[PDB]
Amino acid sequence: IQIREYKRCGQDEERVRRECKERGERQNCHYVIHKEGNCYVCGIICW
Ligand SMILES: [Zn+2]
Ligand SMILES: [Zn+2]
Numbered sequence: 824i825q826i827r828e829y830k831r832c833g834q835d836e837e838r839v840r841r842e843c844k845e846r847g848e849r850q851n852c853h854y855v856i857h858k859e860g861n862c863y864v865c866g867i868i869c870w
Contacts, residue, residue: 832862
């Protein structure tokens with residue numbers, strides 16, 4: 824099992840969330856989005 828994190832700050836929430844979902848989809852893995860204020864961590868989990 825693997826997890827990679829990608830952080831983005833200063834960007835629009837909907838667009839950052841969409842980037843993450845599509846990242847997970849392209850990789851055929853799973854995503855989560857963890858929000859702290861204006862910063863977002865995209866976690867991509869692959870088995
Ligand atoms: Zn899976
Ligand atoms: Zn969270």
